[PDB]
Design a protein around this ligand. Structure first.
Ligand SMILES: CC1=C2O[C@@]3(C)CC[C@H]4C(C)(C)C(=O)C=C[C@]4(C)[C@H]3C[C@]2(C)C2=C(C(=O)OC2)C1=O
Ligand SMILES: CC1=C2O[C@@]3(C)CC[C@H]4C(C)(C)C(=O)C=C[C@]4(C)[C@H]3C[C@]2(C)C2=C(C(=O)OC2)C1=O
Ligand SMILES: O=C(O)CCC(=O)C(=O)O
Ligand SMILES: O=C(O)CCC(=O)C(=O)O
Ligand SMILES: [Fe+3]
Ligand SMILES: [Fe+3]
Lengths: 285, 284
């Protein structure tokens, strides 16, 4: 028995989606965001896609997830899309789920990064994996009882179906032991969703990019968050301060322009022994 | 009770590392020219009165017994050029840190540099493990888990038992995490001179001692950790022109650089590239 990927409408509330996430490691939330906001971000991303790196980043081994040259991953979204900074980073449903995930075990959270996922036509499926492999301490903790190190929220920017490589998932695989092999991609169900929906899954849920056998790119946007005590993959220190001060204090923290407190109350990312905002006199919306 | 073992830096970083692996702590004598420490001490004294006393805003105090007769002070990059140029590049220290972190974790960088000023009358701290700062430490077995922190403390004046030199429990770095390790009254003190350094891991039981003398006892803690752990102190307010006078290693140490895990994956990247490549960050 291969468990199905379960779904809720965001009208049912964040408690119900969190419950499915706790039981399965993954949940699809239908109609979580106005599709026109997503289409706007999609246009911004399409404007600059010719700038992104194809395949591997410099020096990064590819064999763990099967990173290959029919895939484009692209960061730098804060400067690419104002709609991303102001609308997506502040989406209340997402923050309700993330606070439920992180606050007790870990404390404040922020982004690992925001990442465009472009599977080009003919893209081969990835090796099903756990995203928390990024952080080596995940290999020293029991998955059944350890805190979650990551939550991925993927918004399709065009329709996701099995045939165009929509994310493959292995529901209820988030409590088993860490392993070097979990499944073959061909045995997993795909997340099939429309623009305005989102897929949420934990850093322990087995998953991977699907095979794109259509003739059009399949593009999603991954809002990936983690405890503040883990180092983001993407820094935002090159974002002009004038632009940071048009963001809310929450979105500022998400992109690393803020102090993050552990569940024990201890501050990280402080400046001159004080709060980040206080030490800079940093303004916000 | 095992003693705190010691080596001279002339015996090489391998011997210091071996003692660190066996005991969780080691004193390295004459690891740095005392003139350098004296300069940094001048820099710090010139700005000590602007430091915060006791707990920082909203941080509970009871795990380590933080109290209002101890001054902890950061912001060392901008305080001391000698700190930026000499101390952050000390080769013995980086040899030890590479031995600790490279295989299990990857690149490392500062948790922070922190002046530890213990005024006369300061009570001893509750003996503790520093890695409690990172909640993941409580979910890993100390006997086999990676080290999450290395502390290198340079006395800025003489450390002695009577003036609150750091109390240590040697060989305590492999036992299970616990809510009580020892009473401070039962632990030996790190006693050493300017130019020496005490190294101990995030798993070594230790604490501030009681300063029963008439003068402050002041150390400089250089605390390092895996690049995948968020530093306590950010340095994004340091002017880029100051940063470009530093070495690439010291730049990475203060967070102006990409840090790769032992699996080759980069963290603290900029615009999908290496930090330096994306900014054209120059260095010495
Ligand atoms: C585990 C492993 C990786 O860690 C993960 C999964 C963790 C976070 C993840 C998020 C969820 C943010 C995303 O949007 C999609 C991919 C990344 C960026 C990813 C990239 C990275 C470093 C990588 C690897 C490789 O081969 O090239 C790239 C790799 O094996
Ligand atoms: C665990 C615990 C903390 O974590 C540690 C130990 C971890 C690293 C450490 C280093 C080695 C850098 C140092 O130089 C001296 C003190 C700190 C800054 C410290 C401060 C902090 C947040 C704290 C606590 C408290 O009560 O007030 C303050 C506390 O209990
Ligand atoms: O593109 C997808 O649907 C999944 C991408 C993924 O899992 C990854 O690269 O880590
Ligand atoms: O001052 C000392 O010797 C130790 C300080 C310490 O251990 C701490 O505050 O965590
Ligand atoms: Fe993944
Ligand atoms: Fe300590």
């Amino acid at each position: 028995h291969m468990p199905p990927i379960r779904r809720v409408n965001a009208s049912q509330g964040s408690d119900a989606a969190y419950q499915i996430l706790q039981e399965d490691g993954c949940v699809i939330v239908e109609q979580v965001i106005c599709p026109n906001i997503i289409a706007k971000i999609s246009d911004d991303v399409n404007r600059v896609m010719d700038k992104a790196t194809i395949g591997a980043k410099k020096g990064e081994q590819t064999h763990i997830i099967n990173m290959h040259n029919r895939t484009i991953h692209m960061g730098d979204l804060v400067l690419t899309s104002k709609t991303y900074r102001d609308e997506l980073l502040n989406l209340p449903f997402a923050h309700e789920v993330l606070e439920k995930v992180f606050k007790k075990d870990s404390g404040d959270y922020w982004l690992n990064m925001g990442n465009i996922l472009n599977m080009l036509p003919g893209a081969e499926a990835q090796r099903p994996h756990r995203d928390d492999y990024l952080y080596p301490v995940s290999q020293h903790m029991d998955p059944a009882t350890s805190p979650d190190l990551m939550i991925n929220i993927t918004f399709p920017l065009n329709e996701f179906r099995h045939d165009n490589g929509g994310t493959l998932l292995l529901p209820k695989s988030h409590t088993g032991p860490n392993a070097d092999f979990y499944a073959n991609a061909e045995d997993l169900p795909a997340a099939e969703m429309q623009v305005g929906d989102a897929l949420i899954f934990t850093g322990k849920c087995v998953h991977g990019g699907g095979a794109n056998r259509s003739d059009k790119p399949r593009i999603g946007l991954a809002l990936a968050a983690q405890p503040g005590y883990l180092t983001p993959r993407e820094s935002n220190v090159n974002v002009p301060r004038d632009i940071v001060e048009t963001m809310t204090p929450l979105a500022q923290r998400m992109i690393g322009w803020g102090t993050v407190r552990t569940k024990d109350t201890y501050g990280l990312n402080m400046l001159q022994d004080k709060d980040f905002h206080e030490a800079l006199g940093l303004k916000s919306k």
